[PDB]
Design a protein around this ligand. Structure first.
Ligand SMILES: C[S@@+](CC[C@H](N)C(=O)[O-])C[C@H]1O[C@@H](n2cnc3c(N)ncnc32)[C@H](O)[C@@H]1O
Ligand SMILES: C[S@@+](CC[C@H](N)C(=O)[O-])C[C@H]1O[C@@H](n2cnc3c(N)ncnc32)[C@H](O)[C@@H]1O
Ligand SMILES: COc1ccc(C[C@H]2c3cc(O)c(OC)cc3CCN2C)cc1O
Ligand SMILES: COc1ccc(C[C@H]2c3cc(O)c(OC)cc3CCN2C)cc1O
Lengths: 335, 335
C-alpha cells in the first residue's frame, strides 16, 4: 500500500467517507504515540527541545470562499454553544469571545494580524464605532474583500495594511493587537513576538489564538512513509502546532496576563460545517472554480484538497472528545 | 473518627506504619481528585485562578539534624542513581546536577538563597576555588553551622548573609543565584522574583528548584475535616506547592531559558533514607533533644512530627511511581 496508490483512489473519489476518516484518525493516533512521553521528566525534555529548535530559526475566488465557509468567511475555529448553532452563529460567538478576552473597549486602536477575510475586523468596527480597526494581510484579494465589505456596511473606521508581517516596519503602536490562526504560519516566533512588542505601548494588550495540542508541539508534517495526509494538506511543511503552553516560553518581550484553551469539539464543529456546506454547494463551487483553474480535473483537485482538509480536521480536533488538539489563547502586555 | 482521636493514637505510637502510610496516601488521593479537572479548558481556568490569587498577595540542634539527615544535612530532594545510592551519595549527585543545570563555572560569584545547612554552598566552594559563594539564611544556627564547616574544610571563599530574604536590601549583584526548596515558603512570588532580578546583571543566571505537582498548584493545607496530616506537618499554612509550570507565569522580571522536572521517586528515596536513619539513631536522637526540649514527651512530639513528615512525604512523592508530586527546576536570565 503506497501513498501514490492512496492519492490516486482519493483523487478519483473512490475512498468512502467512513474509510477516509478512519485512515486519517490512524495518522493522528500515531502523532499522539510520538508526542506523549512516559514521564513528565521526559515530556518536558521533549517539549524544551522543540522550543529550543524554534529559537534557532493562486488565491481562491471569494465567491467560492462564500460557498464553503460561513458568512464572514472565518478561517479559524468557531464557537458553538448549541447543537443547533449554525456556522454563522458560531462565527459571531467566537468574535464576541475574542472581544471579551482581549478586553476590546470602544475608542481603542485595534490591529488584527493575518486578518483573512476580516470577519473579526468588521465585527469590532461595527460593534465599537469609536474604535479604529486595522487589518494586516499579505493577500491582495483579502484586502480588497474587506474594503468592499466595510463599504457595504457603512463602516468608516476600517483600514487594511497589505504586507508580509515579517517584513512590515512601522513606528505606529496600537492599544490592542489580535493574532488569530496566524502564529501557526510564523517561521520565527521569537522575532515575531519581539516585533509585536514594538507596536505596543505600556497600555497595549496582545491577544493570540492558535491551534495547539494540550501536551506537546509538532510541525504539521508526515511522521512516516504511511502518512499521505500531512503533506497533501500542507505541501510546504510550513505549519507548526504549538503545545497549549509553548508561548509561555516566549516572554522575552511580552508578559502573560491570562491563558485559556477552547476544547477541540468547537473546531471540529467548525470544519464539519464547512465540509457540509461545501458538499451542499458542490455543483456551484465546481462552476465557480472552472474559469480560474482551467480543467474540471484541476477543479476536482482543489475541491478534494479542501474537503479532505475538513475531513481530517474533524478527526484531529474531535479526537478524545476534543481533549487532544484544541485552541489555545493567551493575553499579554509589553515588557 | 475525629482528628483529635487520630492525633492521640499517633502521638502515643499506636498507629502502625502500614496503617499510617495508608491514611496519608488517602489524603493525597483526595488532593488529586480536587486538582485534576475533566478538560484542559477547566484545568487552565483552575490553574490561572490560582496564579492570579498569588499575584494579589525554636531550632533543632545540629547534632540532632546530623542524626536524621545525610552528611551535609541537605533538606531538599536528593538524586538517586542506583538502588544502592546512600543518602550521602544522593546529596552529592543532586549538588552536581544543580551545578550543571545552573551552569556554574569557576570564578563566578554565587548566591544561594535559603541555603539551609549549606551543603550546596560548601560543594560549590570546594569544587570551584575561584568562585566566591554567599549563602543567605534567616537562621542564626544555620549561618553558624556553615561557617564552622567552611573553617573545618579550609574553605576561604564562603560568606553567609543572615537575613530575611523578603527584607534584604543590597546593591550587590551575582553571576549565579540558586533558590533550592525555598520558593515554596515565599508569600509574594512576583515580588520575590522582582527582587532577585535586581541582584542580577545581564550576564547572571537564576536557578530555582521547588517541589511541585506536574499538573496543578495547591497550598499545603487540609482539604476537609478528615485531613489531620496537612496542619500537623505545617501548622502555619505557609507552604505552597506550585505546579511544574506555575513559574512560567512569573516572567515579569526574568525570562526562562530551560525547564526540567525530576521524577518524584528521587524525593521519595530522600525522605525514606531520612526516616530510616532517624529510626536507626532513635535513642541518640531522643537523648540529644531532651536538654533543649525539657520533657521526654515533648521529645517524642518533635520526633513524631519529623517521622510522620517522612512517612507522608514518601506517600506523596511516590504516588503513581513519582508521576504526581515531583521536583521542578527552571533556569532564567534577567529581563
Ligand atoms: C488561517 S488564516 C487566519 C485568517 C483570520 N485571522 C481568521 O481568523 O479568519 C491566516 C492568515 O494570515 C495571513 N498571513 C500568513 N502569513 C502572513 C504574513 N507573513 N504576513 C501577513 N499575513 C500573513 C493569511 O493570508 C491569512 O489572512
Ligand atoms: C526547605 S529549607 C532548604 C535549605 C537548603 N536550600 C537545602 O536545599 O538543604 C528552606 C530554607 O530557606 C530558609 N528560609 C525560609 N524563609 C526565609 C526567608 N524569608 N529568608 C531567608 N531564608 C529563608 C530556611 O531557613 C531554610 O534555610
Ligand atoms: C485550506 O485553507 C484553510 C482553511 C481553513 C484554515 C483554518 C485554520 C486551520 C484549521 C485546521 O483544522 C487545521 O488543521 C491542522 C489547520 C489550520 C491552519 C490555519 N487555521 C488555524 C486554514 C487553511 O489554510
Ligand atoms: C521538618 O523539616 C523539614 C525537613 C525537610 C524539608 C525538605 C523539603 C520538603 C520535603 C517534603 O517532602 C515536603 O512535603 C511537602 C515539603 C518540603 C518543604 C521544604 N523542602 C522543599 C523541609 C522541612 O521543613
Amino acid at each position: 500500500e503506497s501513498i501514490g496508490e492512496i492519492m490516486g483512489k482519493l483523487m478519483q473519489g473512490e475512498i468512502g467517507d467512513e474509510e477516509l476518516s478512519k485512515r486519517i484518525k490512524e495518522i493522528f493516533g500515531k502523532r499522539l504515540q510520538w508526542g506523549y512521553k512516559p514521564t513528565h521528566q521526559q515530556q518536558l525534555a521533549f517539549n524544551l527541545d522543540f522550543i529550543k529548535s524554534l529559537k534557532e530559526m493562486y488565491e481562491l475566488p471569494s465567491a467560492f470562499l462564500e460557498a464553503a465557509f460561513g458568512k464572514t468567511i472565518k478561517q479559524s475555529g468557531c464557537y458553538f454553544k448549541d447543537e443547533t448553532t449554525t456556522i454563522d452563529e458560531a462565527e459571531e460567538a467566537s468574535h464576541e469571545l475574542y472581544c471579551e478576552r482581549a478586553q476590546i473597549k470602544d475608542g481603542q486602536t485595534v490591529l488584527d494580524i493575518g486578518c483573512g477575510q476580516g470577519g473579526l475586523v468588521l465585527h469590532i468596527a461595527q460593534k465599537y464605532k469609536n474604535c479604529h480597526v486595522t487589518g494586516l494581510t499579505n493577500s491582495k484579494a483579502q484586502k480588497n474583500y474587506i474594503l468592499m465589505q466595510a463599504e457595504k456596511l457603512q463602516l468608516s473606521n476600517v483600514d487594511v495594511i497589505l504586507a508580509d508581517v515579517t517584513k512590515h516596519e512601522s513606528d505606529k503602536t496600537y492599544d490592542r493587537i489580535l493574532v488569530i490562526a496566524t502564529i501557526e504560519h510564523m517561521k520565527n516566533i521569537q522575532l515575531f513576538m519581539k516585533k509585536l512588542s514594538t507596536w505596543m505601548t505600556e497600555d497595549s494588550l496582545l491577544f493570540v489564538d492558535h491551534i495547539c495540542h494540550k501536551t506537546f508541539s509538532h510541525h504539521f508534517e508526515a511522521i512516516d512513509e504511511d502518512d499521505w495526509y500531512s503533506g497533501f494538506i500542507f505541501p510546504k511543511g510550513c505549519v507548526t502546532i504549538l503545545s497549549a503552553s509553548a508561548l509561555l516560553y516566549f516572554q522575552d518581550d511580552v508578559t502573560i496576563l491570562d491563558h485559556w484553551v477552547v476544547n477541540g469539539m468547537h473546531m471540529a464543529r467548525s470544519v464539519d460545517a464547512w465540509r457540509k456546506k461545501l458538499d451542499k454547494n458542490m455543483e456551484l463551487a465546481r462552476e465557480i472554480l472552472l474559469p480560474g483553474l482551467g480543467s474540471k480535473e484541476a477543479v476536482n483537485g482543489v475541491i478534494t484538497h479542501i474537503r479532505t482538509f475538513c475531513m481530517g480536521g474533524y478527526e484531529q480536533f474531535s479526537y478524545n472528545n476534543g481533549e487532544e488538539w484544541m485552541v489555545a489563547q493567551m493575553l499579554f502586555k509589553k515588557k
